Amino acid sequence: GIDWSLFPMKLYQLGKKLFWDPSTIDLTQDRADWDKLRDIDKFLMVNVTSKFGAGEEAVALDLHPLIVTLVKEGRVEEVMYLEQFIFEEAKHVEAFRRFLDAVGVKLTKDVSPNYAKIFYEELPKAMWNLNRDPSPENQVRAAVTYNLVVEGVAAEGGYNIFKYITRTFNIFPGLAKMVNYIATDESRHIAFGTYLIARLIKEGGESVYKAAMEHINYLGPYAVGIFSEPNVPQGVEIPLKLNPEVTVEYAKKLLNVRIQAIQRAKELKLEMLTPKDLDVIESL
Amino acid sequence: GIDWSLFPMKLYQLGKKLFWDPSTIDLTQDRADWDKLRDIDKFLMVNVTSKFGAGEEAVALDLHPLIVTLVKEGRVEEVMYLEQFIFEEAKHVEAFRRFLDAVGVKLTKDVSPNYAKIFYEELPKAMWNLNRDPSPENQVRAAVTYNLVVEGVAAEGGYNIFKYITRTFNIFPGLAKMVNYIATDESRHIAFGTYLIARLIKEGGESVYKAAMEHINYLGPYAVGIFSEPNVPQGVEIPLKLNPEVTVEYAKKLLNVRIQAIQRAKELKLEMLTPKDLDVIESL
Ligand SMILES: [Fe+3]
Ligand SMILES: [Fe+3]
Ligand SMILES: [Mn+3]
Ligand SMILES: [Mn+3]
Known part of the structure; x- marks a missing residue:
């Protein structure tokens, strides 16, 4: 009794078409390129990649309550996609772990408080609050955290750095x-996070919309502050010629795009929804 | 810092070589074959397939504490394989759900007490006991339940039926x-379950070995009784010409094979271990 015309199943079949595996990616040149980096460059590299490795692992593990919540509600389509979501996250963990393994490299909180606030406090709190009370408001706070903030701002801003x-x-x-x-x-x-927040808002009313806007505003400064956390005392040189203002500015703009996506989710036609309507990449 | 020579990583690369997706499997003939089955045959079919759909989903969801336990212990190799394990389980859930969807079909406890004892009581109990106390004894009881019993007896005996x-x-x-x-x-x-039980026993001593033998003996009668649970009042005909004695007898023999695998796990060379040493299928 699966509805294949539902929007989660559209993304589900897309994830199968655009499937990839990081074990088929050669890292021989990457190991050689590791010697091209100075010590301050290697530190910046390990800084971001380990925050990706740890962040993607935190998402893959802490997303268990949302999936359990949706299966108790009998939402088979959305559960099937979250199962693809979780595996892809662990696949991202493998990708970064294979790169760290290839370059020979074997989260401080004290030097990265914004990162720890998101991934070590706010992400597990919003998710394991579903075990306490799987209300629509807690479900939209969970969606805002792991999807629009963790991925829409932190991960996307990390991609810009790489x-x-x-x-x-x-x-x-x-x-x-x-x-x-x-x-x-x-x-x-x-x-999927945009669709999920759209369904919760259109089914829960103004109470759910306020919880999404209050939560993303509350998390906003920490998500942007993640990109103001280089390694230790800075030093004289900026690693890898990065521009710190543009790195931070990009995240701020990402944050506003995610905020406006919540405002647009109120009036969103979910039945006619296609991936192109949400600007989804449909080719590798 | 990944050890690729470790036995979990051997199975990990095997799972990538022998990868498959159930969406590429045509069910057109299966839908036509559904009309060939009498009502008592369709009931038997839905009986087993739904117990597979629900069982594989129970394993995919209840295995979260074991993975969290192993990552806290820093066992990256075994965590990476469990991530493949979980996705494959959800992939099995999709496979059975696509078959039920193709045949147009849209767990009673009262008529299936043995199945409910395993998947609805003993499987969640052994797994969520790790959140309470992730001791080596609870880890071997978890491994015995989901792996040697749920898969080694229940799933394998189900395969024999299909x-x-x-x-x-x-x-x-x-x-x-x-x-x-x-x-x-x-x-x-x-x-992997055999290896995991082997490592826990060789590191925990006699206390861990006793917990594995006590748990599989305790679960044995329920695992075998799963195959004595047809649909409702039986009737005059046996569905699909199944032999009930041989179906049950096969499970009993599977149970003994899993018991002897625990006895052999005491003296097992884990470093020289290869998939062929554990009779693993290495080709599709
Ligand atoms: Fe993601
Ligand atoms: Fe299995
Ligand atoms: Mn990811
Ligand atoms: Mn399975």
């Missing part, structure tokens, strides 16, 4: 290929 | 293809 480094120095071709594939999966993740 | 029906009546070619692929994944699931 793309700048790979094109500026012509390094890490395997990682650049990984980020493209990861950003493709994440495109469907944002669309 | 294979008999498909070859006796020459029906359901899509389902027969699915069961072959599912039984291939499950081959690696049993090997």
Whole structure:
């Protein structure tokens, strides 16, 4: 009794068409490119990649209450997509772990408080609050946290950091290929979160809409502050010629795009919804 | 810092080589074959397939505490394989759900007490006891339950039921293809459970070995009784010419094979371990 015309199933079949595996990606050149990086460049690299490895793992693990919530409500279509969502997240964890393994590399809170606030406090709190009370308001706060904030701002802003480094120095071709594939999966993740927040709001009314706008405003400063957390004492040089103002500015603009996506979710036609309507990448 | 020579990573790369997706399997003939079944045959079919759909979903969901336990212990290799394990389980849920959807079909406890004892009481109890106390004894009881019992006896005995029906009546070619692929994944699931029980016993001593033997003996009668639970009042005819004694006898023998696998796990060389040493299917 599956409705294949539902929007989650559209993204579900898309995730199957655009399937990839990080074990088929050669990291030989990436290992050679590791020697091209100075110590302050390697620190910046480990900083971001480990926050990706740990963040994607936090999402893959902390998303268990939402899936249990939806299966108790008998929403088989949305449960089937979250099962694809979770595996893709763990697939992203493998991708970053294979890169760290290839370069020979074997979360402080004290130097990264914004990152810890999101992934170690606010993400597990919003998710495991569903075990306490799976209300529509807690479900929209969960969706806002892991999807629009963790992925829509933190992950997407991280992608911008990787793309700048790979094109500026012509390094890490395997990682650049990984980020493209990861950003493709994440495109469907944002669309499902937009749809999910749309369904909760259209079924729960103004009470659900307020909870989404209050939660994303509350998380906003921490999500943007994630990109103001380089390594330790800075030093004289900026690693890998990054522009700190543009990195932070991009996240702020991402945050506003996610805020406006909640405002547009009130009046959104869910039945005629297609991935192209949510600007979803439909080709690898 | 991944050890690719470890036994979990061997099965991990095997799961990637032997990857399959149930959406590429044609069920057109299966829908036509549904009309070949009498009402008592359709009931038997829905009986087993829904217990598979619900059982595989119970395993995919209730396995969250074990993965959280292993990541807190820093066992990255075993966590990476459980991530493949969980997705394959949800992939099995999709396979059975696509078959039920193709045949147009849209767990009673009262008529299936043995099935409910395993999947609705003993499986969630052994798994969520890790959240209470992730001791080595609780970890081996968890492994015995979901792996050696749920998969080694219940799932494997279910496969025997499907294979008999498909070859006796020459029906359901899509389902027969699915069961072959599912039984291939499950081959690696049993090997990892054997390895995991072996590591816990060799690191925990006699206390862990006793917990594994006490738990599988306690679950044994319920696992075998699962195959003594046809539909409702039986009637005059046996559905699909099944032999009830041979179906039950096969499960009993499966149970003893799993018991002897725990006894052999005490003296098992884990470093030289290969999939062929655990009789793992290595080709599709
Ligand atoms: Fe994502
Ligand atoms: Fe299995
Ligand atoms: Mn991801
Ligand atoms: Mn399975």
